[PDB]
Design a protein around this ligand. Structure first.
Ligand SMILES: N#Cc1ccc(N2CCN(Cc3ccc(COc4cccc5c4CN([C@H]4CCC(=O)NC4=O)C5=O)cc3)CC2)c(F)c1
Ligand SMILES: [Zn+2]
Lengths: 1132, 384
């Protein structure tokens, strides 16, 4: 009884693994990046990374490795999913079609077994003889690697050592030999085994157990010719080969522990290391020893290269380039230039890839356009803390507004020879063509000499030979720049009226009724060069010069009124070089030819609002590539505005859009405007690189932003931001933050780097009196005020010592007109486990200064706060308390309600406090105002880890819980039994695959009522640790049933990578119990329906029983689904 | 407050040499399938909440119970003990199944008395309390499952820092500056990925298994000088059950701890109870302090509390104290059936209401805790 619809508004960005190898081809060098469920395949070139393929797998990539067995030309990819769905993939492309085929696949989980504490380890034999997986304690799983093992069957080999830290395969061994470090009561040890496939058991290792450091963490296998393994702890790096042994204690690595590594030389002479706080090291192996051809180590020098982002996965690309794959920061692409050394750093950054995770807090704010929200996150951690502002859509910054009664055409002109800039814009109404002049802020209607006065101009622009043209409804009149005299005027021989006009730099082709005349603009002349007629009236014409030449279009495209067909014909003739019969009924309204990214297209817009993009051949002929995109429900006018050193096409309609090319495909962003009827690029002197947009009410001039669907501005703080709230009246942001300060031997706390708290305009330190070892790191909490326009730190309030600030709310209380920042803290001491004292402090930002209006001292930790109807509701430990803002600016207790749970989460909707804890103990309350106390309505207790919770509506509540799941609970208020009334039934399950930290009501698209509204009700955004912003909406029962049927039918048509069943992937998963998903419709699977081929589209729908408004219409068509699916795509 | 010399050889208390010596023993364990309904016979005349892992002594006299237990030993060996609520007369909805490990039948007194000892194994909730005309009603039993949760960091863990999640063992044992400093780096290194989530590390330490177990061990040693690993299990399930058994709480709190399905919630509840508890006063008076919480030691490996049977079959749970107050004794110190091998129990009563709170266990030898051992029971001891 929930019927909800979940979709991804921004794909995950945090990198949890990256490999290199010859995957796509034996010649190319590929960098494969797994970000979560998405696998990105790049190609390493001199300029950088060139994306090639984007595949999204049905699972979280836990292990991926590239291996090449015998008899293969390029490396294969082995991927293991967190649900233990193993597979082996192979790249296969034929010209334009790219397919990642599944060589093998099979689930490798066990019926019984506790997953290991150190997690999944997946290793592949260097000779590609088997695959070793350590999924479960006390069991080594081995997958034999033979061509006949297409189901990936594996056998378990018993390990007597239950605590295994790191295991890898050794290089240069006749039989597959593993090496690992394990934990014992006597300490940590290194051991090796000789795995035998025939006997299906272990054997005696080449070199026996050796005692290692008490904190030995990783094993790295040195390749031939050195051999053996290198074991890196917190204080030492040791090399083991049996008889040969080395040990070093470099002091440059004692500060932090190494977590990641990657070989940089095929011969393993040098290694690359990274630690927790983000500095690159450089382990070096010296092969100077050579007695009788044998190569042995002699030293283990460690060199510090520099500081990079906090890395999770290092990888060395070709020619001194390192890809630092960060997960709590931003990915980098750095240079290992050993000669630069500007100040003592060996690394310089080249690129920086956006990474929004971890998203700890979000808020939706109408920053620029009223009605359209913007997401301001609290991303990153440690030195990578930053605020991200995500905006959906290209936006136009208005700079002028001249009211006009429905301009029917805007066209720029230059009435100033040798000016190199626009001078005036020639508008054209229904009956007259006014010529407005605009140099600076001028709006004068300065009529040109050669332009007609009372006519609806069809074209007006700068023509060749320093002349201006004006293709009016009467005749094509040519004018002059300097003398401004009518050089020529080609009237219709039969005194007919021109229907459609199209002009180029040197040519002008006009259509009078069903006849087409081609006229060349010779210097001070206009002589017809051709004349022909078509079957029906010309709906539209387009003669745009393609690449090069730019003086004579080889082809001209037209549209037929009574045929609904588009043809391309040679300009100096009438020979139909190609034809097409796209659709029917509604006639074409505009034709345009573009050159997006050196590839030529041909865009035709029908009168119903659908643009049918197609490919065109410049030399001769054309392709078909029929891809109809429904960009609005009004006739579309297509114009080309460069504005980027690129082509770009602005499709004016009820939903204005910019059609650009991202890499080699045409993307379709949407412009944040209500409706633009006509547009024209005005590069006027006073308006640099502006664009005149004419709605049905007025003409506006402004500048477009950057052609990109989602834009993420970054404001680095260099400290971890915890919570964020927005205060409208002050135009400021209230953000909590923490910085790490080391305890020096002077009684103070010195910092580690310049942060946003130590670099504010004005500063403060909390001064309240209501109540170690050299090297210890202590957290210092601040409340920063950040401007919403400049995003500069206006103030930085520092809290007391040992005080942890937990929550934050910006609301006005009681009858007071002032709005405040309410901050709830907790005084935490290392000696004690659970705090005894906290503090509710009310700030007030005015005149650029932060003042503490009021201060309340409570007994506990204030885990959350909400503004329940002019009354702060606080959750002090396990007590939910409601406060009243007195007339003297002092908080007063009104009612208490004691729980047996820690009220970590408080979400209110009217008078219904939703209370939860970290044990998934969702509790529902109601606040009776006539009596003034809280009352418990429902309860749903189930032992499980719950990450967040949100009130979808008065009945359904949504939350995220363990193993990356989602759920919905619903209270049946109509139950006649009290036991069911007091119970919260669970009506939805879903394995999202992501860890949600925050829910927030809002939407990133324009809020239009639309009279008929939309099939989706409500909108809730969530942000995850990996950096994925989703969106969950409700559905009606009929729509839920239709989408469920379509989702079942898509699963038999769409072939996934690895052949993981969608029902299995979305099944609610947990270490103790997994059930199928219910009540959730996957927006990704549904939205993938638009990308399948037409025969597959026909296969998907054959009995859907589409119509619900009377009848069934059992045929159900296939474009009817397109109408439904696009409506769902528009909600995000 | 007798320190140092605690000479008892404190395991004898948990062997019950009073309920007979050469008692026949039973091999090992059994198992009931999770979430299954079972037919488990109910032995009557027992009114006590049997925590799993807790030993339950029993003497059986009436022929119906003797026959039931005989057929029980010859078919399985498990019966049901129901957690009776405040209302008596079969007002129970939860319970635990007892499973036999020692058995002895005596033909003495012209009767077929059967002396038996059992320990709780599983936890269940009764569907319907079917009654049989024989006298031994069989209950409709649903096996309530036991929940174990992974680390709260396992979902939000970073893969890299996972090898750094297998800690070296605790330094030495039970030493200051080896706990307050070890635990700090333990919390800092275990919950380093709490920065990705929205909550600080100490919050995730409040829901930890090992940290809660450490804090509870601290308080229990603060009372009775425990022997580090004096049979305190490493498993949070078993540790929680042991602590719940040994806590000096009333019946409602025991039932509430029995209702809880997860180890972490049980440990948090025990911490709350043991932190908010101070005095133990006489039920029939709710007016007299017959203890405190500091004056409480353990001569049994099972804690300050264990189940013992008087020769009439009634089961008593006794609380061990150094020095009880407001108790008057009657009768010479006698030693016929003492559950503690070497003392001579003297019956104690409230100084006002005169109710059987417990006994004073005076010594016999001289290398003993000299006449300082009050084994107060729970029939009159309301935590106040
Ligand atoms: N149907 C039937 C049927 C058949 C046979 C029955 N037989 C009757 C005769 N019984 C022998 C006998 C009787 C009396 C004693 C004295 O012991 C008593 C008496 C009363 C209360 C308590 C104790 C000991 N005690 C505590 C003190 C603290 C401690 O440490 N341990 C304890 O046990 C008490 O609380 C010893 C042996 C054997 C059984 C029968 F009773 C029913
Ligand atoms: Zn009394």
């Amino acid at each position: 009884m929930s019927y909800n619809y979940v979709v991804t508004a921004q794909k995950p960005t945090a990198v949890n693994g990256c490999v290199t190898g010859h995957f796509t081809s034996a010649e190319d060098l590929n960098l494969l990046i797994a970000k979560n469920t998405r696998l990105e395949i790049y190609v390493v070139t001199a300029e950088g990374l060139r994306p090639v393929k984007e595949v999204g797998m049905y699972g979280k990539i836990a292990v991926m490795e590239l291996f090449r067995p015998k008899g293969e030309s390029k490396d294969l990819l082995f991927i293991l999913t967190a649900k233990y769905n193993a597979c082996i993939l192979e790249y296969k492309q034929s010209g334009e079609s790219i397919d990642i085929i599944t060589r093998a696949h099979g689930n490798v989980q066990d019926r019984i077994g506790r997953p290991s504490e150190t997690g999944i380890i997946g290793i592949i034999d260097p000779e590609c003889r088997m695959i070793g997986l350590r999924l479960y304690d006390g069991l080594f799983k081995v997958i034999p690697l033979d061509r006949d093992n297409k189901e990936l069957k594996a056998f378990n080999i018993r390990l007597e050592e239950l605590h295994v830290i790191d295991v890898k395969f050794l290089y240069g061994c006749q039989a597959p030999t593993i090496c690992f470090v394990y934990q014992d009561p006597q300490g940590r040890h290194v051991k090796t085994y000789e795995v035998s496939l025939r006997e299906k058991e272990f054997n005696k290792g080449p070199w026996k157990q050796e005692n290692v450091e008490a904190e030995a963490s990783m094993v790295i296998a040195v390749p031939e010719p050195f051999g053996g393994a290198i074991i890196i702890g917190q204080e030492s790096i040791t090399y083991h080969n049996g008889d040969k042994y080395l040990a070093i204690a470099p002091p440059i690595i004692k500060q932090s522990t190494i977590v990641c590594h990657n070989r940089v030389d095929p011969n393993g002479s040098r290694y690359l290391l990274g630690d927790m706080e983000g500095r690159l090291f450089m382990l070096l192996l010296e092969k100077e020893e050579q007695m009788d051809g044998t190569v042995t180590l002699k030293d283990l020098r460690v060199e510090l290269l520099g500081e990079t982002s906090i890395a999770e996965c290092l990888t060395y690309l070709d020619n001194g380039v390192v890809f630092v794959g960060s997960r709590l920061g931003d990915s980098q692409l750095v240079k290992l230039n050993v000669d630069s050394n500007e100040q003592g750093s060996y690394v310089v950054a080249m690129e920086t890839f956006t990474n929004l995770g971890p998203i700890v807090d979000m808020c939706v704010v109408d920053l620029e356009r009223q009605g359209q929200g913007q997401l301001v996150t609290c991303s990153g951690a440690f030195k990578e803390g930053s605020l991200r502002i995500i905006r959906n859509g290209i936006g136009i910054h208005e700079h002028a507004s001249i009211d006009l009664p429905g301009i029917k055409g805007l066209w720029p002109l230059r009435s100033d020879p040798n000016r190199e800039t626009d001078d005036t814009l020639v508008l054209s109404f229904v009956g007259q063509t006014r010529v407005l002049m605009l140099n600076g802020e001028e709006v004068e209607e300065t009529e040109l000499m050669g332009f007609v006065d009372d006519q609806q101009t069809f074209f007006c622009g700068n023509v060749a030979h320093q002349q201006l043209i004006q293709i009016t409804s009467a005749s094509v009149r040519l004018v002059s720049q300097e003398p401004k005299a009518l050089v020529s005027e080609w009237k219709e021989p039969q005194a007919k009226n021109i229907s459609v006009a199209s002009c180029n730099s040197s040519q002008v082709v006009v259509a009078v009724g069903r006849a087409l005349y081609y006229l060349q603009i010779h210097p001070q002349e206009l002589r017809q060069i051709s004349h022909t007629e078509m079957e029906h009236e010309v709906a539209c014409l387009d003669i745009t010069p393609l690449g090069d030449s730019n003086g004579l279009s080889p082809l001209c495209a037209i549209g037929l009124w009574t045929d609904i067909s588009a043809r391309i014909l040679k300009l100096p003739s009438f020979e139909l070089l190609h034809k097409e019969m796209l659709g029917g009924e509604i006639i074409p309204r505009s034709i345009l030819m573009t050159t997006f990214e050196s590839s030529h297209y041909l865009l035709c817009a029908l009168g119903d609002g659908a643009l049918f993009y197609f490919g065109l051949n410049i030399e001769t002929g054309l392709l078909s590539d029929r891809k109809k995109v429904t960009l609005g429900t009004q006739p579309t006018v297509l114009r080309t505005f460069r504005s980027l050193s690129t082509t770009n096409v602005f499709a004016c309609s009820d939903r204005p859009t910019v059609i650009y090319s991202s890499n080699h495909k045409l993307v379709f962003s949407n412009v944040n405007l209500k409706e633009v009827n006509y547009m024209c690029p005005l590069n006027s002197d006073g308006y640099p690189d502006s664009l005149a947009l004419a709605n049905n009410s007025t003409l506006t001039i402004g500048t477009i932003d950057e052609i990109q669907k989602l834009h993420i501005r970054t404001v680095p703080l260099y400290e971890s931001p915890r919570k964020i709230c927005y205060q409208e009246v002050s135009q400021c942001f209230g953000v909590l933050s923490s910085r790490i300060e080391v305890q020096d031997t002077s009684g103070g706390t010195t910092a580690l780097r310049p942060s946003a708290s130590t670099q504010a305009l004005s500063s403060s330190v909390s001064s309240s009196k209501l109540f170690t070892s050299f090297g210890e790191e202590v957290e210092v909490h601040n409340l920063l005020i950040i401007d919403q326009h400049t995003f500069e730190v206006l103030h930085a309030h520092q809290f007391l010592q040992n005080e942890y600030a937990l929550s934050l709310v910006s609301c006005k209380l009681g009858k007071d007109p002032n709005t405040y920042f309410i901050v709830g803290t907790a005084m935490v001491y290392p000696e004690e486990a659970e705090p005894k004292q906290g503090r509710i402090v009310v700030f007030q930002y005015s005149d650029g200064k932060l003042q503490t209006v009021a201060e309340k001292e409570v007994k506990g930790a204030v885990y959350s706060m909400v503004e329940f109807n002019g009354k702060l509701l606080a959750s002090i430990n396990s007590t939910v308390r409601l406060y009243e803002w007195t007339t003297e600016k002092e908080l007063r207790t009104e009612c208490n309600h004691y729980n047996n749970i820690m009220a970590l989460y408080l979400k209110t909707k009217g008078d219904f406090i939703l209370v939860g804890d970290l044990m998934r103990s969702v509790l529902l309350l109601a606040y009776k105002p006539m009596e003034g106390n809280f009352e418990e309505i429902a309860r749903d207790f189930n032992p499980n880890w719950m990450s967040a919770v949100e009130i979808l509506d008065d009945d359904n509540f949504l939350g995220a819980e363990n193993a990356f799941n989602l759920f919905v609970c619903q209270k049946d208020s109509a139950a006649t039994t009290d036991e069911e009334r007091q119970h919260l039934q669970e009506v939805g399950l879903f394995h999202l695959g992501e860890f949600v930290n925050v829910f927030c009501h809002g939407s990133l698209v324009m809020q239009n009522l639309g009279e008929t509204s939309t099939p989706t009700q409500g909108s809730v955004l969530f942000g995850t640790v990996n950096g994925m912003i989703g969106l969950v909406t409700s559905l009606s029962e009929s729509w839920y049933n239709l989408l469920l049927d379509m989702q079942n039918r898509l699963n038999k048509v769409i072939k996934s990578v690895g052949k993981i069943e969608h029902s299995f992937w979305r099944s609610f998963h947990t270490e103790r119990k997994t059930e199928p998903a219910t009540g959730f419709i996957d927006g990704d699977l549904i939205e993938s329906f638009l990308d399948i081929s037409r025969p597959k589209m026909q296969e998907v729908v054959a009995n859907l029983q589409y119509d619900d408004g009377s009848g069934m219409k059992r045929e159900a068509t296939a474009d009817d689904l397109i109408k439904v699916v696009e409506e769902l795509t528009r909600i995000h | 407050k007798k320190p140092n010399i605690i000479n008892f050889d404190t395991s004898l208390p948990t062997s019950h040499t009073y309920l007979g010596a050469d008692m026949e023993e039973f091999h090992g364990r059994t198992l009931h399938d999770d979430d299954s309904c079972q037919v488990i016979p109910v032995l009557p005349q027992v009114m006590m909440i049997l925590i799993p892992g807790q030993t339950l002594p029993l003497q059986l006299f009436h022929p119906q119970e003797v026959s039931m237990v005989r057929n029980l030993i010859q078919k399985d060996r498990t019966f049901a003990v129901l957690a009776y609520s405040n209302v008596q007369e079969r007002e129970a909805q939860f319970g635990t199944t007892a499973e036999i490990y020692a058995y002895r039948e005596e033909q003495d007194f012209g009767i077929e008395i059967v002396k038996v000892k059992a320990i709780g194994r599983q936890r269940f909730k009764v569907l319907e309390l079917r009654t049989q005309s024989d006298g031994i009603q069989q209950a409709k039993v649903q096996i309530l499952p036991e929940c174990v949760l992974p680390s709260t960091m396992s979902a939000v863990q970073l893969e890299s820092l996972n090898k750094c999640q297998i800690f070296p063992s605790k330094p030495v044992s039970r030493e200051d500056q080896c706990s307050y400093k070890w635990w700090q780096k333990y919390q800092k290194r275990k919950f380093h990925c709490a920065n990705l989530t929205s909550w600080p590390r100490w919050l995730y330490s409040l829901y930890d298994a090992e940290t809660l177990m450490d804090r509870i061990k601290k308080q229990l040693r603060e009372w009775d000088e425990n022997l580090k690993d004096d049979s305190l299990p490493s498993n949070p399930i078993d540790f929680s059950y042991r602590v719940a058994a040994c806590l000096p709480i009333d019946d409602v709190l025991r039932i509430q701890l029995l209702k809880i399905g997860s180890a972490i919630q049980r440990l948090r509840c025990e911490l709350d109870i043991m932190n908010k508890c101070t005095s133990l006063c006489c039920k029939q008076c709710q007016e007299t302090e017959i203890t405190t919480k500091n004056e409480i030691f353990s001569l049994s490996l099972c804690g300050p509390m264990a189940a013992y049977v008087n020769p009439h079959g009634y089961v008593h749970e006794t609380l061990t104290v150094y020095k009880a107050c407001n108790l008057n004794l009657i009768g010479r110190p006698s030693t016929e059936h003492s559950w503690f091998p070497g003392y001579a129990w003297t019956v104690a009563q409230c100084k006002i209401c005169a109710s059987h709170i417990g006994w004073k266990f005076t010594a016999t030898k001289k290398d003993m805790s000299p006449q300082k051992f009050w084994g107060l029971t729970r029939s009159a001891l309301l935590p106040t």
